Ligand binder design. Structure first.
Ligand SMILES: [Ca+2]
Ligand SMILES: [Ca+2]
Ligand SMILES: [Ca+2]
Length: 403
């Protein structure tokens, strides 16, 4: 299951439309051995990139293109074996109309009928000024800029599950990416996972790593991955729900700048969520927020290849990012890593064994068939065993495969 992020922060800007543009990269995405691609927010939204949605059913006002174009793209992907997954932004919603009070707290789902046309009652009790006090309090975090949806309300629950099943049915999406899954509770999410039953669902729980007396992350980030492990757990360990492993992204960001000892934690196992529940963890080097033009938490650019060398050989489900693959000229090495990965049947739950994690050498063995070395350590020699040919190498990584 190697996922791809078919967009970045600037994609909505594209001359001629992102969906259309992306039609042209379908063959290449399919060839690379990519099983799923994460598409941006499809409906109408105040903020052009889509994370500020209003008329949930109006795909035609998307800056990425329209409903027609989306079903053409998703048809293409499906035509060449890959699954499309959608960015579900349901913690907050922007309203279409002012109620008399003068607050924009009256919604419009996009259709002549009443689906999704809620009002201030569906906004969380305390989200002033939007909320009129009559809804439930927020089950999770708040998003400053917009109305928060009260997911404890039953009409919100039914019509939102309706919209979800419509997106699988009419549009053809296969699974979900839950934006700001901290915005609402794991219990709420489970109702949406469970009742729309997607073939894949990854949630975005993003919180800070812990920092010691140096301005640098601790080595022990167990409080941080625990939070990811508990969401998957409360939501359903047997469900399709997984979460982006922000703990490996954080550690790795630093680790790669000559601190590869950070890559074996307090327990001699990988410090990320992949060291406690690789199965439910999907790894990434960067996404539209951490990187792209937001640069919220960038991976060292001159090292994004050691990032990929690590997430493509290691357990967890890897996620490649449009940019790195298509625009940074790394298409080929990324490809090659994906091939080593698929050739040896490495997957979700591959056994990982760390051999060395010193400042200048992280050397590890996946499933007994592949060994990945990250680092500038020249004299690696003696540590990689008999019967191992090198599969790929590049800037400060090399992977060997059992012959
Ligand atoms: Ca309506
Ligand atoms: Ca709010
Ligand atoms: Ca919320």
């Amino acid at each position: 299951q190697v996922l791809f992020q078919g967009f970045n922060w600037e994609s909505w800007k594209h001359n001629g439309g992102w969906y259309n543009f992306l039609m042209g990269k379908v063959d290449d995405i399919a060839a690379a051995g990519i099983t799923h691609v994460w598409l941006p927010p499809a409906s109408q939204s105040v903020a052009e990139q889509g994370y500020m949605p209003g008329r949930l059913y109006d795909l035609d006002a998307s800056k990425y293109g329209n409903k027609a174009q989306l079903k053409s793209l998703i048809g293409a992907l499906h035509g060449k074996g890959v699954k499309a997954i959608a960015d579900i932004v349901i913690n907050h919603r922007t309203a279409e109309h002012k109620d008399g009070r003068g607050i924009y707290c009256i919604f419009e789902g996009g259709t002549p009928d009443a689906r999704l046309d809620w009002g201030p009652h569906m906004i969380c009790r305390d989200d002033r000024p939007y909320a009129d006090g009559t809804g439930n309090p927020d089950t999770g975090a708040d998003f400053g800029a917009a109305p928060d949806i009260d997911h404890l309300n039953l009409r919100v629950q039914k019509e939102l599950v309706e919209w979800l099943n419509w997106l699988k049915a009419d549009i053809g999406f296969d699974g979900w990416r839950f934006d700001f899954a901290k915005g609402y509770s794991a219990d709420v999410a489970k109702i949406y996972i469970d009742r729309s039953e997607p073939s894949f669902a990854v949630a975005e729980i993003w919180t800070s790593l812990a920092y010691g007396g140096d301005g640098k992350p601790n080595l022990n980030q167990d409080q941080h991955r625990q939070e990811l492990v508990n969401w998957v757990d409360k939501v359903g360990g047997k469900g399709p729900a997984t979460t982006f492993d922000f703990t490996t992204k954080g550690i790795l960001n630093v680790a790669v700048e000559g601190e590869l000892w950070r890559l074996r934690g307090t327990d001699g196992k990988a410090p990320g969520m992949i060291g406690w529940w690789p199965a439910k963890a999907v790894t990434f080097v960067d996404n539209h927020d951490t990187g792209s033009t937001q640069h919220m938490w960038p991976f060292p650019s001159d090292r994004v290849m050691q990032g990929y060398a690590y997430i493509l050989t290691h357990p967890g489900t890897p996620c490649i990012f449009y940019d790195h693959f298509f625009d940074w000229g790394l298409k080929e090495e990324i490809d090659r890593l994906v091939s080593v990965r698929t050739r040896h049947g490495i997957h979700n739950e591959s056994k990982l064994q760390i051999i060395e994690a010193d400042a200048d050498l992280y050397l590890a063995e996946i499933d007994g068939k592949v060994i990945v070395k990250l680092g500038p350590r020249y004299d690696v020699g003696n540590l990689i065993p008999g019967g191992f040919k090198v599969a790929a190498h590049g800037n400060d990584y090399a992977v060997w495969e059992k012959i």
